[PDB]
Design a binder for this molecule. Structure first.
Ligand code: V67
Ligand code: V67
Lengths: 181, 180
């Protein structure tokens, strides 16, 4: 879990965070300042301790409408010439009404904890996986503290879906994070 | 390291290997079948055990020259709508003359072992890093043999490039694996 936190910061957040505000700048110029509230000039990393990583947010919850991509950023990265970073902008709805707009993705290494929890040889329990997901969640911040960009640029949304999955909506969790801030 | 093998397989290779031949085929249709050879239709993953992951292949070896991109694949992945996957095709020179064409990139997560080795608080030596690199490699090899999509789509190029000197040719290492 220590290794995943470092890996994620070094493999991704280190590369995308620096150039993110420049990309919001141009997005607002061309899309009539959709991302106005400084609260929505941040990257929102969904960190379900669930360790579930679905592909489509509109499918998990229909109240997270996809509205637009950021502008693409091309980085020369590890033997890829012009690796392409696309980031998705979402509108969050409440009772039919647009209650928010933000840059939403999941922390992908979390699926590693899930996959590894299920391995027959070196597997472990849902409760041990919950513990490793927390060590991950905690460790990312201590690395995160030291880097001047970071805090202004992205925010972790940490959450545990009930044993069902119902009685819980992810739109409500996202809305309560932007509103609190 | 156990964690990096699973993370690299689960979070990247799982996603990109199934579409690769379909992408090589469209590429071949628009680039006078540049990837004609059998050696030319694998994703080759550079696995330097020194965990040196530089960003440019023409800079590391002048006999590896960028030719073109595969067509992109668009994948809905962990809240990114149409996340963009690209892969780079390179001509491999021998005696100043084109000898091979292939899809080439580094195993990015090795950068983690490198940064950890450079961390003053980690207390993680170069000897300890090499042992993790080898364990990463091995655990990745064990995952890939156990998956059908690896057989004709994926090849690990694992090398121990010495600290100093020029006795190691990445180009020739790549041309070795390409012909086998
Ligand atoms: O290693 C990669 N990804 C990951 C590795 C992890 F270990 C992990 F836990 C999560 C990921 C992840 O991508 O989410 C990776 C490598 C190359 C490219 N790529 C090259 C051109 N276009 C895209 N993209 N991703
Ligand atoms: O987690 C990622 N990457 C990695 C994570 C690792 F733990 C690692 F060791 C290596 C990587 C890597 O990408 O090389 C990641 C996540 C999202 C995006 N992305 C791309 C376009 N929109 C979003 N790209 N990468």
């Amino acid at each position: 879990a220590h290794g995943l936190a470092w890996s994620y910061y070094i493999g991704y957040l280190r590369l995308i965070l620096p150039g993110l505000q420049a990309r919001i700048r141009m997005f607002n110029q061309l899309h009539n300042n959709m991302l106005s509230g400084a609260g929505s000039r941040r990257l929102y990393i969904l960190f379900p301790l669930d360790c579930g990583v679905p592909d489509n947010l509109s499918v998990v919850d229909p109240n997270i409408r996809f509205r637009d991509m950021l502008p693409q950023q091309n980085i020369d990265r590890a033997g890829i010439k012009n690796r392409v970073y696309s980031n998705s902008v979402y509108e969050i709805l409440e009772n039919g009404q647009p209650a928010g707009v933000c840059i939403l993705e999941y922390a992908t290494p979390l699926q590693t904890l899930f996959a590894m929890s299920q391995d027959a040889k070196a597997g472990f329990s849902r409760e041990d996986r919950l513990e490793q997901a927390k060590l991950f969640c905690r460790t990312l911040e201590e690395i995160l503290e030291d880097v001047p960009e970071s805090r202004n640029n992205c925010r972790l949304i940490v959450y545990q879906e009930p044993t069902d999955g119902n009685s819980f909506s992810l739109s409500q969790e996202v809305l309560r994070h932007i509103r609190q801030e």
